[PDB]
């Protein structure tokens, strides 16, 4: 009788340590995407200097 | 002093400017209530039409 969003939240609560794994996922992918962007431009700044 | 004795309040408190402000705001609420009741009657007449 619940909403399907509530079905998603109760499926989410049935997972051991889900939120830390989501944080692990986003920090790994986001920090990797930042590392792709930052270091060639930093090498370009070093080459300019 | 006559207005202080008229409204049954002691004259040591501000019985001159506060009565003017209270009464001015009450007369503005009188005209505003008249205006909103006229608007309510006119909108009810327009909805009935």
């Amino acid at each position: 009788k619940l909403a399907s969003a509530d079905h998603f939240y109760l499926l989410l609560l049935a997972i051991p340590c889900y939120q830390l794994r989501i944080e692990c996922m986003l920090l790994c992918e986001g920090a990797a995407a930042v590392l792709d962007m930052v270091r060639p431009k930093a090498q370009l700044v070093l080459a300019a200097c | 002093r006559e207005l202080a004795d008229y409204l049954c309040e002691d004259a040591q408190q501000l019985s001159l400017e506060d009565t003017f402000s209270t009464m001015k705001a009450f007369r503005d609420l009188f005209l505003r209530a008249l205006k909103e009741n006229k608007d309510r009657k006119e909108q009810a007449a327009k909805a009935e039409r």
Binding site: A3, A33, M37, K41 | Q43, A47
Partner: protein
Amino acid sequence: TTALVCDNGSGLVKAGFAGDDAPRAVFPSIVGRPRHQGVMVGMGQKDSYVGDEAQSKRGILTLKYPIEHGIITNWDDMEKIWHHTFYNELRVAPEEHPTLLTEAPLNPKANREKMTQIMFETFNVPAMYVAIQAVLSLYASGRTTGIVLDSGDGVTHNVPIYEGYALPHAIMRLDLAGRDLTDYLMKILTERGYSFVTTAEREIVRDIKEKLCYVALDFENEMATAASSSSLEKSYELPDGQVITIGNERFRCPETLFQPSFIGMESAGIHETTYNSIMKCDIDIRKDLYANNVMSGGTTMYPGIADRMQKEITALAPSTMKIKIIAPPERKYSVWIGGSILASLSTFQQMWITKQEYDEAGPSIVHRKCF
């Protein structure tokens, strides 16, 4: 009951039921009136052909577009369009089905007043709602924030949206879209000698634009390549069977989107409109907007437009910051798809405009209830 989504677009009307992913009735918004002399007796032939019927018999018809630059010009023609999409294409009674409408930003308000009056008097509905098309395009992407460049058939408009709230002052409008590209393509096909003057020929030039045109990544190099060798030349077969061949007109036509001075407009291109729309916003909410360009509209089907968009914005943007052009493949119907998403929620049920609200508030609650 099951709701309806009817994107009443400037060139094509996309109607269908809520909860669905494909719009059931996609048909162009035209009215075809006969101009020659009938000689058959037997009646049968109407005095006005609407939709695909006007497209099929277009060689003897004057075609009138009711919507011009997101503004409904002839209200009788648009009433005929609404009557055709309610009674013939979708075949639903209007007074038993909720129906979601779409409207372009910065419109004249009396256009919204007249649409509200027709949808509550002529095709009176149990409920309806009028909403901004770029918002529904963002809702199709599954994201809450981002900027939508919606380039339809009459209006190309930029809307940035932060946390589901469209920022009103930063929205800009440009009266340059697919009909003007069709008119410019009609103008430049006379260079090769292919003359097109009738309204029926505009559909042929539009089909040429749909099937063969594409956005150049670098315009000057594509000039040099097309003028150098005949590699980008492509041939098209006409309905009478003549074969034309077009070269640079494949990419001189969409370049009016990035250079509006080709058709005499003083205003800047869509990339500059996007950039100046973003600089009209606050600085702190800029971080969502460059990373969430969600393009929409039928004009954005040209298969070089995402890379050109990314190139022009990354030229314009500060270099420290991510540019991401989310161009979904179904972004033509993203207005309709996002309409089905928004119309298939229990949270939307309190947001409807009932007939009772129309009766107490006139046809003017659409300026208040609908943002």
